[PDB]
Subunit: 257 residues, 4 copies
């Protein structure tokens, strides 16, 4: 009765490392991403080590592509058990009056609508399967951290996410669906690191950390496999009493920023 | 002293317009429906103070720009923003909530919050400071049981995040940004004519002594929330910024 | 016209709070560690129009608290308003190096103090048929965790908020509102404490080239500021507010 | 090598489950409790199932006993790597004005002073050893739930515990010590079973849950083995980047109460 997971934003970072992690537990993985070739490459690697995997190309904020990806995946394997809502962008960070409506919309569409679409379309199958496990990947931003220069839209979306998670934990417990949130700090790259960041000087409260600001690793970002490991635990039956909890994975950086 | 208050046709918005006008604050009552805000403006001019009624859908760039331009062109400046406009939208099980229903709750409560702040911050900067309050809820902040209320929960939780980013971003411009978080006001907690399948989503519970401890039973008054906003946009609160405040008579802890 | 007990009233937030509450036709019992100070505020309250009494007592001591609350009901007949506001910073040190008595002392004053202050005043407030309580906490333990070696303090400030919320629900039917106040730096810098050791061992080094109190370009908040909020929270202007924390930090806290 | 753990409250419930869960990954265990015999059978069970354990009798509010127990464990196995501060008592729940100062003192001494003592004594050994992992078992009370009838004193100490965990995550990051808080809901017994509960009708907001108040389990409280599992995850290397975090294990309940 081998378990099935949809993992979004699987083409890289945490999503990718998550996909490997779970494949290694013999979870068969639907790896959905915005770029065919990246998601093909991870599905390949998974099959290369004798796993099961479909690459699914889709834009997470698009209703039709998503329905088509979900239907596709259930058809190939028969059931759905595990969902990781990981797709997100940072989008534009800029002064509240410089951030344009259309660029606000875009961060809301991928990060926020994508979460709604992802769940709406998968919850039916989970309900039918008799239960499963959901994790949505949020952030320290909007939960513990409010300093990332002009990141309001992102922040808004990331706070929304943990709220969705707790609402649904309750809605879905009677259906034996566990819903958790995972909140990373900087993974792989600096917290501030966005090429669509504009006008840092206006938004940043200036600050120097002579000894880094990620205490457990001595200033260094956490790594994709770290988040992977956590999601792997939370989607397993080892976490069978855990629902509607966030879990911060920031090496202490949340408490700092 | 000039205030823009959105969702000002009724409820908290109407009550805040009145309370603030009573402190001598020129009010720009803004709302979905013209006659509602005309009436609130009229009562204010009628009772002594200065006002103007502004008809805009809060999710709409264009109306909002006009609405803001017009308020600034009639009174000179901006000092206070109460971002209050919003909707419950449809509450339904996550699988029954439609994409377009989801989009509409986000459009009004979230995008409308963005736009409201997006357009008023330059004026508050020019004036050299001011006070913002965004009206959230116990939903998304303490309370996660309101049935199928996901989209709404989302927006309310988002707002508090916005408030804290903006408190830090704007502190140096002397703009204070706070979040007010009422429990049930006027109407009770789960009264929404667009609720579907409440059966399937509420976790069944009974409250023999009620679940608003301080008013043992009934919801709070719009004028209550108005009082809080009044305090929070006043000089009495000069050092308060980036704080949420729960006005739920304890209901937030129960639910 | 109603009566309020203010602990820690000899100075700081306490004093400011006694003053502002007077300036509202509120009769104050100023309770402090050291009489010279509290009779000094009480004197200033009287003859400047208002009713007031000074009370000497240590919050962590059962008998004195029982004593002094008795003494304040006798003189004015009732209690309407308690403001629990007495604390020490106490010793801040590495958890490694902080000592049991030092730890113990910060629990006595801040935690046991607050339990006692409410233990012996709730009953009169119920009898009055309702009133208002506010407990003065801190960004420490609520939003802030970098104050070097302040664990003990942080423990008690965090417990205060928990207490507020528990009793807010327990005392709702008695029409007693219960709220928290959580100041950032007031009058003084946030790591300013003469009983702090091994700062460099404990503190994560950080430089704030432009301050870390946004609304003030980096100057600590003022006692009157906090007082004003307390004054709001005890008035009937806030009839519906109970079981809530309110942060008064000028944004620091989102920052520390 | 083989790491050494100190688990306090290892007599029964979560502590005993934890000791066994830890021992199963080959961790050496100092099982510590108030009553010698309870921790004798958890030690003796691990030993002769292959493990290494020793029983440590101590009152967690007493400096000298705690110091000696901690010291014994280091003398026996040479180092300390893991610490699960779990000892705690419900104490007396009563109206605020009914609750006697001495019985207030009792709850603080055991719950709070016992946490300080547990950490103060163990931390030097973790430093010395060059790293390690700590978890304090707090509760949904004081963090999410505030309705447990007149449980003020208890609630107060649990909320302090999670605040300490965060200070200490920051203070000990550079020393490579992770410190997280686990907050279970009801486990083994209902949320409200306390023989020293007193005037519960005067303190409860009356409430009825026709379908129960713990979603993921159709109203039943979680198992000790559940909490142990979380603790096991959090003290291992699968959690290298997690520190400073609460985690709720309440099957939804904390969101209800």
């Amino acid at each position: 009765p081998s378990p099935v997971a949809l993992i979004t934003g699987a083409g890289s970072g945490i999503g990718r490392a998550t996909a490997l992690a779970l494949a290694a537990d013999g979870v068969t993985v639907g790896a959905l991403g915005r770029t065919r070739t990246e998601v093909e490459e991870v599905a390949d690697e998974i099959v290369g080590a004798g796993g099961q995997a479909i690459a699914l190309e889709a834009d997470v904020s698009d209703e039709l592509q998503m329905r088509n990806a979900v239907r596709d995946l259930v058809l190939k394997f028969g059931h759905l058990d595990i969902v990781v809502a990981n797709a997100g962008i940072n989008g534009v960070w800029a002064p509240i009056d410089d951030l344009k409506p259309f660029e606000w919309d875009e961060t809301i569409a991928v990060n926020l609508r994508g979460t709604f679409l992802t769940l709406h379309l998968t919850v039916p199958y989970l309900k039918q399967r008799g239960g499963g496990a959901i994790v949505v990947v949020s952030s320290i931003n909007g939960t513990r951290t409010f300093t990332t220069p002009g990141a309001t839209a992102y922040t808004a979306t990331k706070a929304a996410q943990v709220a969705i998670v707790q609402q649904l934990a309750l809605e879905l417990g009677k259906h034996h669906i566990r819903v958790n949130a995972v909140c990373p700090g900087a993974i792989e790259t600096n917290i501030s690191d966005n090429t669509k960041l504009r006008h840092e000087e206006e938004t940043a409260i200036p600050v120097e950390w002579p000894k880094g600001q990620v205490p457990i690793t001595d200033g260094q970002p956490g790594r994709s496999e770290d988040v992977a490991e956590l999601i792997r635990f939370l989607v397993s039956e080892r976490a069978r009493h855990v629902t509607g909890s966030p879990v911060w994975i920031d090496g202490g950086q949340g408490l700092l920023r």
